[PDB]
Design a protein around this nucleic acid. Structure first.
Ligand SMILES: [Mg+2]
Ligand SMILES: [Mg+2]
Ligand SMILES: [Mg+2]
Ligand SMILES: [Mg+2]
Ligand SMILES: [Mg+2]
Ligand SMILES: [Mg+2]
Ligand SMILES: [Mg+2]
Ligand SMILES: [Mg+2]
Ligand SMILES: [Mg+2]
Ligand SMILES: [Mg+2]
Ligand SMILES: [Mg+2]
Ligand SMILES: [Mg+2]
Ligand SMILES: [Mg+2]
Ligand SMILES: [Mg+2]
Ligand SMILES: [Mg+2]
Ligand SMILES: [Mg+2]
Ligand SMILES: [Mg+2]
Ligand SMILES: [Mg+2]
Ligand SMILES: [Mg+2]
Lengths: 164, 206, 71
RNA sequence: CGCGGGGUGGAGCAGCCUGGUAGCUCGUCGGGCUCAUAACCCGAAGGUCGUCGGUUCAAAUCCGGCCCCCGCAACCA
RNA sequence: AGGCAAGGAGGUAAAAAUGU
RNA sequence: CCGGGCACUCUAACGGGACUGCCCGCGAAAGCGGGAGGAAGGAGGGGACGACGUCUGGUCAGCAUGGCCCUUACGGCCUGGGCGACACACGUGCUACAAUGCCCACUACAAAGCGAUGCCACCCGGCAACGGGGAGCUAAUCGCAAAAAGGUGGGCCCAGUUCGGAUUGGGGUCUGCAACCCGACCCCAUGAAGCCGGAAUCGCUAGUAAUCGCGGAUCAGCCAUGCCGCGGUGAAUACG
RNA sequence: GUGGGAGAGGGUGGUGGAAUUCCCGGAGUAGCGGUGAAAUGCGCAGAUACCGGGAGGAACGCCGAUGGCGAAGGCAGCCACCUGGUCCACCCGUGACGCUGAGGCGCGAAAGCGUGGGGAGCAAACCGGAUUAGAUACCCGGGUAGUCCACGCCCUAAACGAUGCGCGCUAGGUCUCUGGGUCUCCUGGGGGCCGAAGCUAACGCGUUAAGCGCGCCGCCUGGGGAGUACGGCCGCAAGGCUGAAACUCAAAGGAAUUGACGGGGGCCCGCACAAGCGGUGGAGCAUGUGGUUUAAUUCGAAGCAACGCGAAGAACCUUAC
């Protein structure tokens, strides 16, 4: 994802855009560089595809750093995927339910996802049967986000906390 | 598995061909075919005689069919007439002037194919296969051949399992060319399935 | 006597059960406890729930069958 | 009716607020990796940001209305 | 100064489920 | 070209040559470091060759063979079709995405192999594939055949283009009884995607990779860019 | 008995520093800590790191051992007290007073529980963060009981030398610690190691025997069921002792041996990775395959070692559909 700086800029007449919400026109590469120098914020080819390449006057590195930080923040609060079957047992089901409950308590969203084989005929019903029941059980902690929808080789149900 | 045919290995060196004669591209295949046919027919006939090398030459439509044999009188007849009949048959098979040489082998236990054939015969009337092999080996040793390995495989004793029966004696440097190893092959044609009679004999250096 | 009053009826495998025994849902009624035939075991032919298999059923007790056919 | 907050690749959510420059997780499909399955990794596929507008050289972003979704009150009568 | 070795340091040896 | 020569290459039979043999140094030895002479040095390079066994690997579809099963058909013959079908996926290759290139024109060096209804010199017809005529060989003695990249000169000028060549239309050439399914080839038109490729990954230690052509076998013809083979240019880097 | 000796033996009372934390004081500022990486965590009210003192509580560095002590559990700063065991030397006193021990009584780590205290660190549970498909876990940040003491109770353990105690005999050597000697060597008592004979299933044991005996006690008669039920006793509880059967399986096992295997070790190797050049995957096409479709798409090959493979020549042929 290269928004390109200073003399990473090959294009002749770049659309020299300012830092904020201003422009300087469609000016040369050298001109753009000079402008960047003036602001001390780098010249950055943020839209190369655009009607002459969009060349923002921004400090590139700092911006990138900020973006990275934001990304990191986004990493976390999160979603737990509880994977059911068609051939899954009653004790197993209970275990899964318990896990889901724990997750809810913690403050995590819940993708209860069923993983299917062949017999996508007597798969969907069983997926519903398990998942619906589970949802009914955890109603006290959980507002269902996504209902039991069959999606080709899988089935999803999702639960969100009522409150945390 | 592995192991290339031991004569095939030699051939260029101390060993010489099962037949030698020139033929160019136009007529080479025909002659070869004829030779093959001859070999087949002789095998069908002289299985009694015990044969190793069926050496052929073409000194210009003078086909040569030297039989290297164990039982020389079996070839000739009782005077000199089964030699004659066979010759006639051979002539009939190939439309050219032809002869029949017999160069019987001093010590048949020295010739490996003969040994193999013997072993096969023994197997066919059902002997203790391993025992037979051992006996053969002993015979070979007595005959002086400094090495003998006799692999017989497949369903030994009519047993319902893919078995390899081994047993060997002496130096068998199946690898050095300077070995003059006589290889012998025979096919034990027995009722329950075929037993492969592979035989080797190491009999002289340089 | 060697008795062939045996029923050779189709059945979609319902239940995965232990020891290569599988309750298979027959089209001769219900799902009986049907076990693998030795040939299948030998050839390592895997049965999962959902296979329309021929199941060998003796009249003496139809409770137990045999997965005769490889799916 | 009164007020606040949000509507975004299929779902959850970042970014809006500070005009230009849309990300991650789950899901879809394909591959890889593995002896093989999950797991894994990768991609590829896939959003104009509810919508109609205007602003401005240029809107997810500034602004209005409608459409929704959440909640709080709705009093004297 | 090198020669070997004893001991003390500290750095390294990540993680990776299963069964025809 | 010829006489003429066996000198040189060569061709292909025989034989020498290298053995850690010589020297130094280390080492008990084996051997190791370096040198010398020597075309070659420590197995000179490369083959050919694959131990007991293993995976009940693979092949009853090359052949052989036990058993079972079929015998007016699970046998036989032909004609036509099918093996080439195509929403997809993978493997293996080629050709690319250019200017260390592309095109055109001249010019120069190979080896190894083949060739008899086979290769086809040369001559003309044709833009050409080829066609016709026709010498020559029975192959070191002629032919395939031009090797190509390369070298000189010209053009092209950074573009999806003189890059790239797929597809699609049209005319033909050849083989064969017959190329519609489903041949190759020529010529003209068409000129798509692709601007060096994600995770992953594979080859390669020297005349090696990389790239460049030629020969072949099967074969009427060829879907051969495959395989097998031969030479031309000719690298990198290995601390570990 | 007398003369000695060694020692973390036990209890009672004290003290001695390092260290930790916590408090005050000072100087000082932008992070500390933490990790395979990180994040939670603390820090501007100023942490951390550094010095000064003080407050505690706990443990005892070096010596320190392959060592010493006890009957075992166990036990280490040091000192004092009370106090066990033991070893030698003299062979002086007694004259078989001994050995063993069902029961019984006593001790009995650690955890646990009761009553009261104390509480620095560590730290189950627990609350966080990461790690992860999941994380009740390994890893980090706290954190309660508990660890510590008194008194009481609990009584189990790989309570191990997996070796009951007692004595007698049956090669040595070698190192050790501790006593006496006529002291470069003898002779006792302990602790180890190697090995004669012998034993053992082998490993190993081998004067500290698992050797040869004798003495007595404890227990064993296939594994699982199960140290469970059932009773009984003990206990404030947790549980402990005491201890089956029904059934079930043709095994549960030990010791070694050959291999294989190990995210076991050492030594090696190979284009195996690195170092390098060129690709593959992205494009089209050439092909072979899987899948799919077909009237049939003949059949096989399957990770390396199936996938320009059989096929080194599918228009008909070939050809098997
Ligand atoms: Mg039956
Ligand atoms: Mg005393
Ligand atoms: Mg302070
Ligand atoms: Mg006395
Ligand atoms: Mg007296
Ligand atoms: Mg703590
Ligand atoms: Mg966590
Ligand atoms: Mg936790
Ligand atoms: Mg902790
Ligand atoms: Mg307490
Ligand atoms: Mg015990
Ligand atoms: Mg006792
Ligand atoms: Mg002691
Ligand atoms: Mg002693
Ligand atoms: Mg002994
Ligand atoms: Mg010992
Ligand atoms: Mg014993
Ligand atoms: Mg217990
Ligand atoms: Mg009780």
């Amino acid at each position: 994802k290269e928004y390109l700086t200073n003399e990473r800029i090959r294009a002749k007449q770049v659309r020299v855009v300012g830092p904020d919400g201003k422009q300087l026109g469609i000016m040369d590469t050298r001109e753009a560089l000079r402008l960047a120098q003036e602001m001390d914020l780098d010249l950055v080819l943020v839209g190369p595809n655009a009607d002459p390449p969009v060349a923002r006057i921004m400090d590139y590195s700092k911006w990138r750093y900020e973006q990275q930080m934001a990304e990191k923040e986004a990493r976390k609060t999160e979603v737990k995927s509880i994977k059911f079957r068609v051939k899954i047992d009653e004790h197993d089901y209970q275990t899964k339910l318990g896990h889901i409950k724990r997750f809810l308590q913690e403050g995590h969203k819940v993708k209860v996802t069923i993983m299917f084989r062949g017999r996508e005929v007597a798969h969907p019903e069983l997926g519903e049967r398990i998942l619906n029941r589970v949802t009914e059980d955890l109603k006290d902690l959980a507002v269902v986000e996504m209902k039991p929808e069959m999606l080709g080789r899988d089935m999803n149900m999702l639960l969100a906390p009522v409150k945390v | 598995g592995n192991k290339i045919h031991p004569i095939g290995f030699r051939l260029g060196i101390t060993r010489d061909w099962e037949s030698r004669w020139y033929a160019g591209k136009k007529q080479y295949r025909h002659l070869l075919l004829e030779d093959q046919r001859i070999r087949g027919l002789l095998e069908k006939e002289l299985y009694s005689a015990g044969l190793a090398r069926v050496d052929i030459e073409r000194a210009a439509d003078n086909v040569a069919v030297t039989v290297h044999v164990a039982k020389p009188g079996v070839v000739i007849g009782r005077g000199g007439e089964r030699i004659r009949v066979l010759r006639e048959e051979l002539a009939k098979l190939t439309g050219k002037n032809v002869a029949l040489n017999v160069q019987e082998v001093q010590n048949p236990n020295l010739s490996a194919p003969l040994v193999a054939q013997r072993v096969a015969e023994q197997i066919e009337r059902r002997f203790a296969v391993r025992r037979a092999i051992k006996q053969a080996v002993q015979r070979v040793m007595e005959s002086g051949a400094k090495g003998a390995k006799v692999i017989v495989s497949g369903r030994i004793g009519g047993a319902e399992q893919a078995r390899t029966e081994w047993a060997a004696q002496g130096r068998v440097p199946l690898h050095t060319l300077r070995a003059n190893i006589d290889y012998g092959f025979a096919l034990a044609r027995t009722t329950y399935g075929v037993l492969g009679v592979k035989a080797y004999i190491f009999l002289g250096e340089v | 006597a060697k008795e062939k009053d045996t029923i050779r009826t189709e059945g979609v495998v319902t239940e995965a059960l232990p020891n290569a025994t599988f309750r298979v849902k027959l089209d001769s009624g219900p799902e009986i406890l049907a076990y693998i035939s030795g040939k299948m075991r030998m050839h390592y032919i895997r049965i999962l729930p959902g296979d329309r298999v021929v199941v060998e059923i003796t009249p003496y007790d139809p409770t137990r069958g045999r997965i005769v056919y490889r799916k």
